[PDB]
Ligand SMILES: Cc1cc2nc3c(=O)[nH]c(=O)nc-3n(C[C@H](O)[C@H](O)[C@H](O)COP(=O)(O)O)c2cc1C
């Protein structure tokens with residue numbers, strides 16, 4: 001008990017709320033954060049909880065100097081009871097569906113065992129949300145067992161057809177915590 | 186009327202004729218150009234029409250400083266009545282079929298609505314043209330609604346089986362203009 | 371006779387044995403080596419046979435200055451009777467299955483004709499080996515005609531379910547040489 005939650009941000013404008021999302025999980029769980037290089041255009045590091053360790057692509061090397069040593073993506077994958085990607089960019093979505101491993105975040109996921117819960121809160125402009133790759137990539141992740149926390153539809157301009165703003169932090173948090181408490185530990 | 190045509194070059198040796206292709210469209214349409222980083226090994230910037238604005242991956246940041254501001258890939262996608270990729274590299278072809286968004290060009294395409302016409306003129310060495318991923322990726326783009334302007338087969342050494350040199354600018358131009366005039370505006 | 375063997379390393383910790391693997395092939399064949407940028411974190415250049423030319427992504431430009439000139443990925447693809455990727459990373463595996471061409475190694479492969487033998491010795495941590503993309507990507511490469519030289523299962527901690535350490539150099543070598551001698555030249 002006291003779940004180990006790995007929170008990740010990818011290169012979406014919604015990464016500006018990532019510090020806030022981290023704040024939601026920290027009383028309840030042990031939180032560690034992973035970010036992509038593009039997410040750093042949108043995230044303020046001083047907005048995170050001070051107790052949260054933020055790992056970047058460069059940390060993949062700071063742990064590993066010689067053969068034997070710990071590999072960070074593998075170490076974070078073993079550590080976690082759950083992984084939450086919020087926001088999940090269109091590009092990261094595609095790289096996960098492509099089975100790629102070119103940075104800390106996709107390499108943790110390419111090492112993933114789908115018996116451990118993995119939640120994603122996609123965040124993208126409505127025109128990317130409605131492009132046919134959104135549904136194809138999310139259907140693939142769904143078949144693998146990922147849990148989609150759907151974006152806010154009718155947000156800001158609506159139109160009613162999907163829309164793509166990231167789910168609110170409070171919903172992402174409650175969805176993961178209610179899951180947990182229904183069972184895992 | 187006076188169609189807004191987005192012309193793009195990817196990292197093929199045929200990008201050296203991209204300035205010429207731009208010249209073909211400028212009396213008839215409002216033209217804007219997008220290039221990939223690899224295309225700049227092959228394109229001379231002084232060969233473009235002087236009235237054509239060339240956008241690069243770096244322009245994605247020059248428009249966007251703070252939340253609210255215009256995102257260039259989305260802005261170019263809204264602006265365009267049609268998108269023409271000529272040349273279309275094997276790598277860009279694969280990234281489009283993979284639904285990726287890692288630069289201005291693939292992000293415009295990952296935001297695409299296939300009710301708007303999208304034409305591609307693939308350009309690659311015969312050995313890549315004949316590799317089985319060429320047919321698989323082009324069949325996928327075809328199913329989405331892209332329009333292939335086939336490469337020149339029997340060019341330079343022929344052999345008769347595909348061959349891969351980019352379609353001539355005059356054919357790319359006439360194909361897009363005859364389409365337009367048959368209907369869109 | 372005296373086969374032309376292209377040996378490649380990708381970004382796996384098993385690339386530290388790449389010099390040794392090269393040594394296995396050099397009396398029997400003409401050997402040329404290709405490496406990815408990530409493989410250079412793990413390979414010592416002084417461990418290669420002195421007669422082996424090592425090509426990197428930067429060599430793609432040192433051959434090509436102007437239109438007409440030789441393109442290295444195409445030149446290496448024509449030269450080779452066989453290609454051996456050992457180690458084959460999870461990321462390279464995914465990029466090959468994605469039909470991408472973003473560096474010397476994937477571009478040689480994206481130009482490949484599967485009538486020429488292509489052997490791969492995957493090397494990855496057990497958790498990536500057991501992730502479902504390993505089997506999906508290897509099934510795709512198999513259908514194309516690639517020859518898998520399976521990783522060592524029961525290695526170091528076993529568990530019995532796959533396991534991922536790269537096949538020993540001696541097995542990779544004997545598998546390719548017995549194939550050759552059964553027929554090609
Ligand atoms: C100003 C700007 C805003 C961006 N916003 C989004 C977004 O909200 N959602 C999305 O999917 N992509 C967005 N993108 C594009 C991604 O940042 C780009 O695909 C990036 O490669 C994603 O990298 P990552 O997935 O490794 O983090 C935006 C790009 C720019 C320049």
Ligand SMILES: Cc1cc2nc3c(=O)[nH]c(=O)nc-3n(C[C@H](O)[C@H](O)[C@H](O)COP(=O)(O)O)c2cc1C
Pocket residue numbers: 194195196197198199221222223224273274275276277308309310313430431434441471472473477
């Ligand atoms: C000298 C040279 C010539 C190239 N010519 C071609 C070509 O004609 N067609 C193609 O598909 N790729 C070609 N490539 C490989 C692409 O440039 C490489 O895949 C690049 O990543 C494509 O980037 P892009 O698709 O983002 O523009 C060539 C590479 C080199 C070094």
Ligand SMILES: Cc1cc2nc3c(=O)[nH]c(=O)nc-3n(C[C@H](O)[C@H](O)[C@H](O)COP(=O)(O)O)c2cc1C
Pocket residue numbers: 060061064071101102103107379380381382383384406407408409458459460461462493494495498
């Ligand atoms: C310390 C360390 C060890 C690595 N070991 C492996 C490995 O053994 N197998 C693998 O598939 N990936 C491994 N990776 C991840 C790859 O290096 C990373 O995916 C890289 O992008 C692969 O690049 P490449 O395929 O272009 O060479 C490791 C990464 C790090 C930081």
Ligand code: NI
Pocket residue numbers: 102287472
């Ligand atoms: Ni990439």
